[PDB]
Design a protein around this ligand. Structure first.
Ligand code: W71
Ligand code: W71
Lengths: 57, 296, 242, 245, 50, 242, 49, 99, 57, 48
């Protein structure tokens, strides 16, 4: 079959790549899934607040 | 039977609370119709930066907006798109007459922090995991292609590092070596994510030894062994003077990239490898300057 | 052997070419990937994070560099006095260069989307005041007075518990994308101008500082995206790294 | 119900009536190490309450000229309390932190502090001014422990990086007209499940005055800044004798 | 041996044969010998206009 | 012919590249493979085999080389006297180099797993005694006395019919894998230290040797694995083989 | 490697040859194509004018 | 004395936690360890000399001539396998010549 | 079809390899099965004994 | 720096005029007889 040894193993992202060797790290970079999570850096707040509200109550 | 505080005791919870989720974002967010809003109690525009969160105010709340179906892709902004671009990371000289590397062989310590362009991009993040495609472009200093045979040899840390052009180490019985003529297209090869750590570390705030940490040893601050992948050795295959002065340029293209903890982009000129040192007397502003805040 | 016919492009080494190459280590298996906090997936994730906008990019004494991070606002006397001014263009030289957004733009040729600039007032609790922040779309020359600046997109900001207010610089462009704006000709891609005026005045009781500062934090909105990445110009070093 | 708050760990309770919510670094609560994320086979210690509690480490005086300070973390809490002990006695350490920086004044004072967490905060040197000399920061500067260390070139965070962009890190501001304390909860961040509390400092805490402190004369001129912090989910393994460094 | 490098507007344009810009860390460059068949590459419709 | 376009890496000879190549003998059929005892499948099979650990790697007289294979233990007088000491690091120079494990490590850049070291007492049936073997994890400097050494991982060994005792050097590391440890910087990957102390004392009746020897045999535990193989440094010859 | 045998025409650059070539910009996405009046499909369209 | 390695487990010598070891053992197989090209022979064809003038040589096929490769194989007593022989030729300077 | 002439013929191990010639010894080294038997060298004892026991009864 | 190692509370002045310090029952015995300097200091509660 093929060795599962690329850096992105167990990665929550899904890639479709090409390869001609038994080791998967040799595969192309490939096209991949476009999921983002801004809140992680832009809104790491504990108790969220909406824009419509006044951030300080 | 148990003591209760032991039964609840959430000590040993291996999974993290999260608080955020990754959603699909193939295109830019579209704009929806907005109309005038004259009301009390609702203030989008008003924020409290102290909290530490970016303003969540939408365009629709600040002006009457039309509707726009944004189909602009966000594909080119992925880590792979941004990083999977070959770039120069190493340069090796093999001159005929000189003090650099005569004898006909060299040992390049594998370290990508030697060139400003590539270095800055990666120093955008604190941790990075990835495979890479190393391409080696060789020729003379004039850029001339010559009928010469070379041998590149990856030498993992702990392996015998060649001491001469005819070193026994060139038998490369277990190390991976490459034999190429400068007349053949630049050699390219695929490298995995080798390293005992889960990711390469661009910045390691600490020491690696456990000693006294005196003056002389401050040389080891920020030195993280999980990043020293060993050396890359090259020689002209033979037992006599090369006959042609050579140069090898090492290009690296990252692939299957994962990156963590973004940091502020490099501000001052770089001075040394694996060492954020800056020129104290030449501390320049992040960017351009004007004459007054009230004039362009 | 099987009949082939090599074409132009043969043997070329294309930096951005994404193909395969022989693996150096057969059957090698990487170190497991632990779970680490703060994983990044797309750079856009970073562009929506506010960073300090050096509106006051005037000082250079190396002793006063920290002074650029914030501009002053103080008790005026007249009416509609101009506080500060700056280009909305993010990929252009200027204040935006201090921001992570501006920095990441250097890496892409074109961009698109609305921008936001939150201004946080750092004066005393006792100080009040109303300001008028105005975005002046392309073609409009730097407004000479408030009565002119107000004709564009704007917001009247009132100081209160809510320290800061955010000015949204909507994506108002003729083209779908914008290449970095830069004085000669490429000023075609200019975003516009931001001007801050005194709506009323900085008022304060006796016993409180007569002058305070405002801090600008800027980022991109959700409809923001970039394309065709190049290399940042901004920076380039000098003496090969030792 | 947002400007008032109470933090309680172990036998310690912090109170506040002018808070500005709580930041959770990279949106993740501190957790213990997975059974498949770990390698060290020995069963660890999880002292719990004796270590996961608030330690009020130090006070700095904010002055109209202050440049700003920083504290490297894992380190800062060594030598102090039962936490410090488990850290010297054990090789491996792992933990998150609840950092509460406090500083108050009157409605007549003004100023703004930037409180941020910068992971792997490697320090640099001025390189002898000319930048030709390859100097290196001393053990006294890289790992000051409590008492922290004052910045000399905050604009570049003494490391050639723009502070203007420091906000891409879990941060929070202390704007006197608005609040009087910062609260940031940081999860364990490293490329390894455990590491040595001694030679490695997972991150640094920066407290920098971006908008200078100011006030008319006659108002109390002594505006202190106090750093209180609490380890969370502390785990230790690799027991031997006690090592200082 | 030659190096071709596409330099999108806004990117540092090389000032000399040894310009730092030739590190081409993000720009797309091509390295070819004049002895190799002419280099050929595929370019998309780049432009903010339609 | 069919359109192709050769890429970088063309014509290169990659030592570790695993591809195909024309067979020199068409239709050749190998000699049948008889059944032979002791077939090896994985090198790890060999790493779990105990080999003599030259703890006493001191003598060099070429007449006394056999002396390294075992260290002495003799009737002491005091309390808690130190018998011997050594690094747990297997890929490092030192005692481990005498073992098959240490030797096979030279061939791989990194390793992981617990290690075991069985000590066999070879004195007279009449001699008794209790020893304390202790593994001192990273960061802990070579224990000055027993009272310090005991704070780490250890085992009290009692001499009896069961000649030997085994000290398990559990995998206690910060990283998932370890590259070979070696003095400068790479001491980061050090495993730790093993120290042998007298728990009570070597006791013997009249008519029995007052001094005997212990033999150390070491190997790797079941959770042991290695990766990224390189070439052994240890050895390299001199005059091309005649 | 897989047995091949290059034929005449190898390395030639044929102006009108319609083949493929490596893309310079990975994952690049063009500007949307607005609707514009007067699109031409075939030159014959012009010859009847 | 028995001649067998200690079967003692880590769990019996210390209180251990639980660890799910997913580290691969693939790189330790014979093929992984041995399928690495290595130098085993060297042949000279000088112009002027006493070694091999005339323009031809006869190398007795024997891999025991070079230390690196030799030691690896001498790890075992018997070995069965196929092999890929690669021949790298050039002048003593390492120069490629139309020959 | 193809000649069955590689060194590992009749081998109790299973390999997945690539080949373009009629002789199978020309095939790649390939990925393969990971079975081990330590006891063969580490415990070639006639009557086994457990760890919990005293090796000499 | 020493006092904080025990049970404590950081009090912030605000609308809520007062704060309450709970002196938890932390004793070796189930009950305590009145504490008093000599010997009976055994029953001491502690210090604030
Ligand atoms: C065949 C062949 C292949 C090679 C070279 C293989 C190189 C693999 C390099 C992987 C590099 O990963 C790095 C991670 C971090 C750093 C780093 N430098 C300063 C601190 O971090 C450098 C390289 O040589 N011959
Ligand atoms: C075409 C073509 C192919 C060749 C060379 C084929 C060589 C096949 C060699 C197989 C070698 O197997 C060996 C086994 C044992 C020893 C050995 N040397 C010392 C005792 O054992 C050497 C080689 O030449 N031309």
């Amino acid at each position: 079959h093929e060795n599962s040894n690329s850096a992105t193993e167990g990665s929550t992202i899904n890639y479709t790549t090409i390869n001609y060797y038994k080791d998967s790290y040799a595969a192309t970079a490939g096209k991949q899934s476009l999921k983002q999570d801004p809140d992680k850096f832009a809104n790491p707040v504990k108790d969220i607040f909406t824009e419509m509200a006044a951030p300080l109550k | 039977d148990r003591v209760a505080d032991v039964i609840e005791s959430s000590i040993g919870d291996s999974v993290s609370r999260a608080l955020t989720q990754a959603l699909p974002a193939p295109t830019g967010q579209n704009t929806q119709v907005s109309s005038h809003r004259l009301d009390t109690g609702e203030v989008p525009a008003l924020q409290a930066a102290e909290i530490g969160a970016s303003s969540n105010t939408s365009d629709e709340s600040m002006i009457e907006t039309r509707c726009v179906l944004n189909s602009h892709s966000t594909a080119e902004t992925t880590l792979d798109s941004f990083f999977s671009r070959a770039g120069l990371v190493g340069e090796i000289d093999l001159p005929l007459e000189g003090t650099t590397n005569p004898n006909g062989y060299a040992n390049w310590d594998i370290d990508i922090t030697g060139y400003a362009q590539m270095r800055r991009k990666v120093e955008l993040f604190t941790y990075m995991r990835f495979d890479a495609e190393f391409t080696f472009v060789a020729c003379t200093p004039t850029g001339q292609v010559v009928p010469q045979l070379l041998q590149y040899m990856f030498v993992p840390p702990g392996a015998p590092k060649p001491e001469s052009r005819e070193s026994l180490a060139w038998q490369t019985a277990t190390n991976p070596s490459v034999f190429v003529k400068l007349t053949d297209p630049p050699a390219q090869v695929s490298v995995p994510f080798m390293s005992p750590a889960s990711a390469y570390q661009w910045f390691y705030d600490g020491y690696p030894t456990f000693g006294e940490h005196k003056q002389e040893k401050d040389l080891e601050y920020g030195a993280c062994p999980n990043n020293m992948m060993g050396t890359f050795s090259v020689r002209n295959v033979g037992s006599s003077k090369s006959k042609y002065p050579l140069v090898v340029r090492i290009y690296m293209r990252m692939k299957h990239v994962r990156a963590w903890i973004p940091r502020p982009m490099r501000n001052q000129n770089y001075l040394f490898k694996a060492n954020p040192n800056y020129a104290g007397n030449s501390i320049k502003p992040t960017g351009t300057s004007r004459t007054a805040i009230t004039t362009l | 052997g099987f009949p082939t016919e090599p074409k132009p492009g043969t043997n070329q080494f294309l930096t951005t070419d994404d193909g395969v190459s022989a693996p150096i280590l057969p059957n090698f298996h990487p170190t497991p990937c632990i779970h680490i906090p703060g994983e990044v997936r797309n750079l856009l994730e970073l562009c929506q994070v506010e960073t300090i906008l050096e509106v006051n990019n005037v000082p250079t004494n190396a002793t006063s560099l920290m002074e650029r991070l914030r501009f002053p606002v103080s008790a005026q006397a007249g009416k509609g006095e101009l506080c500060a001014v700056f280009r909305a263009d993010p990929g252009r030289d200027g204040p935006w260069q201090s921001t992570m957004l501006g920095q990441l733009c250097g890496y892409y040729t074109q961009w698109s989307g609305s921008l936001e600039v939150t201004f946080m007032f750092t004066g005393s609790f006792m100080a009040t005041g109303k300001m008028l922040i105005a975005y002046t779309p392309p073609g409009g020359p730097l407004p000479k007075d408030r009565a002119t600046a107000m004709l564009g997109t704007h917001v009247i900001w009132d100081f209160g518990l809510q320290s800061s207010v955010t000015l949204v610089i909507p994506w108002i462009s003729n083209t779908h994308y914008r290449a970095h704006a830069r004085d000669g000709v490429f000023d075609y891609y200019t975003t516009g101008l931001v001007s801050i005026w005194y709506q009323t005045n900085y008022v304060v009781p006796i016993g409180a500082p007569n002058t305070a500062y405002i801090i600008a934090l800027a980022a991109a909105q959700k409809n923001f995206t970039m394309k065709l990445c190049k290399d940042t110009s901004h920076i380039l070093q000098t003496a090969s790294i030792q | 119900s947002d400007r008032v708050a109470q933090l309680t760990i172990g036998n310690s309770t912090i109170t506040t009536q002018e808070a500005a919510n709580i930041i959770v670094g990279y949106g993740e609560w501190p957790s213990y190490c997975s059974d498949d994320d770990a390698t060290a086979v020995d069963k660890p210690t999880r002292p719990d309450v004796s270590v996961n509690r608030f330690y009020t480490l130090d006070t700095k005086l904010w002055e109209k000229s202050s440049k700003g300070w920083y504290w490297k973390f894992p380190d800062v809490l060594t030598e102090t309390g039962v936490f410090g002990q488990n850290a010297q006695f054990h090789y491996l350490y792992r933990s998150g932190f609840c950092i509460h920086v406090q500083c108050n004044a009157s409605k007549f004072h003004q100023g703004a502090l930037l409180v941020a967490i910068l992971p792997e905060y490697v320090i640099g040197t001025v390189a002898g001014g000319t930048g030709t000399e390859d100097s290196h920061p001393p053990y006294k500067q890289t790992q000051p422990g409590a008492d922290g260390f004052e910045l000399q070139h905050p604009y570049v965070l003494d490391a050639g990086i723009p502070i203007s962009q420091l906000t891409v890190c879990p941060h929070q501001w202390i704007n006197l007209r608005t609040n009087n304390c910062a609260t940031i909860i940081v999860p364990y961040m490293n490329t390894l499940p455990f590491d040595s509390a001694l030679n490695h400092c997972n991150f640094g805490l920066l407290v920098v005055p971006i908008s200078p402190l100011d006030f008319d004369q006659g108002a109390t001129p002594v505006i202190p800044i106090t750093i209180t912090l609490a380890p969370m989910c502390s785990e230790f393994a690799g027991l031997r004798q006690a090592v200082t460094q």
